[PDB]
Design a protein around this ligand. Structure first.
Ligand SMILES: [Ca+2]
Ligand SMILES: [Ca+2]
Ligand SMILES: [Ca+2]
Ligand SMILES: [Ca+2]
Ligand SMILES: [Ca+2]
Ligand SMILES: [Ca+2]
Ligand SMILES: [K+]
Length: 216
C-alpha cells in the first residue's frame, strides 16, 4: 500500500465572494496508483470549517461552498481548510493538504454617522476657514467599500459652510451675519465609494449651526 500524496502541502489563496450561493472553488487530487481498495481515494474537509459551510465531493475532489450557503466576510474573512485524502487499505493510509480561501468583500453594510446629530455654536463673526465640527463615521466593509466621503446635501444657504470630503471637517466658507441668518440646518451625508457607485450606501443626519450674537 502506497500513501495517497498531494502535489503541494498548501494551495491558495482561492477567491470566493461573500453573498454568492454555493460556488465551486477548485479540484484537489491525491496521486495513488494502487490496485483495488488500496487505491480507492476518498476526500473530505476534516478541519477549518467551524460553521459547516464547505464540502469536497468524495470521489471527484471538487471543493465547493455548500448548496444554498452564502459566505459572509464580516463573520469570517479567511478559511484554512484541511483536506484529507484516505485510501481503503488496511490500515487506511492518508495525507492532508491546506487550502486558503479568501472571502472577497461586497458592499453589504451602510456607513454610519457616529457623532451626528450635533448642535454647534459659533461667533457670527467667525472668519472664513474657522473650525465648526468634525464629522465621524464607520463602515463594517473593507477596501473601497468602507472608504467614506462627506458632503453637505441640504440647508447650506448662500454656500455658508464647507466640508472636506476626506476628513469630514466642517468649516466656515463665506462671511456670516446673525441678523440675516441666525441658524443653519445642515444635512450632512456620508457615503462609501464602491467600484460601482450605483450600489453606494449612505447615512444622513442633522448638523445644526447656531450663531452667537456680536456687535455691528
Ligand atoms: Ca494507497
Ligand atoms: Ca456580509
Ligand atoms: Ca460599506
Ligand atoms: Ca462586506
Ligand atoms: Ca453682525
Ligand atoms: Ca449682532
Ligand atoms: K443613522
Amino acid at each position: 500500500d502506497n500513501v495517497p500524496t498531494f502535489p503541494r502541502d498548501y494551495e491558495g489563496p482561492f477567491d470566493v465572494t461573500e453573498g454568492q450561493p454555493g460556488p465551486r472553488v477548485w479540484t484537489f487530487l491525491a496521486h495513488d496508483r494502487d490496485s483495488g481498495p488500496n487505491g480507492q481515494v476518498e476526500y473530505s474537509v476534516v478541519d477549518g470549517d467551524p460553521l459547516g459551510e464547505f464540502v469536497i465531493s468524495p470521489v471527484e475532489g471538487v471543493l465547493r461552498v455548500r448548496k444554498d450557503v452564502e459566505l459572509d466576510r464580516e463573520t469570517i474573512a479567511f478559511y484554512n481548510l484541511t483536506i484529507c485524502a484516505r485510501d481503503r487499505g488496511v490500515p487506511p493510509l492518508s495525507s492532508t493538504m491546506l487550502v486558503g480561501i479568501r472571502v472577497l468583500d461586497i458592499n453589504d453594510n451602510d456607513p454610519v454617522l457616529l457623532n451626528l446629530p450635533m448642535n454647534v455654536t459659533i461667533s457670527e463673526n467667525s472668519p472664513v476657514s474657522s473650525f465648526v465640527a468634525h464629522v465621524l463615521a464607520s463602515d463594517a466593509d473593507s477596501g473601497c467599500n468602507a472608504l467614506l466621503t462627506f458632503n453637505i446635501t441640504a440647508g447650506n444657504r448662500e454656500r455658508a459652510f464647507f466640508i472636506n470630503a476626506t476628513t469630514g471637517i466642517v468649516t466656515v466658507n463665506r462671511p456670516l451675519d446673525r441678523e440675516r441668518i441666525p441658524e443653519y440646518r445642515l444635512t450632512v451625508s456620508v457615503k462609501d465609494n464602491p467600484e460601482n457607485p450605483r450600489i453606494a450606501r449612505k447615512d444622513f443626519d442633522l448638523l445644526l449651526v447656531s450663531l452667537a450674537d456680536e456687535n455691528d
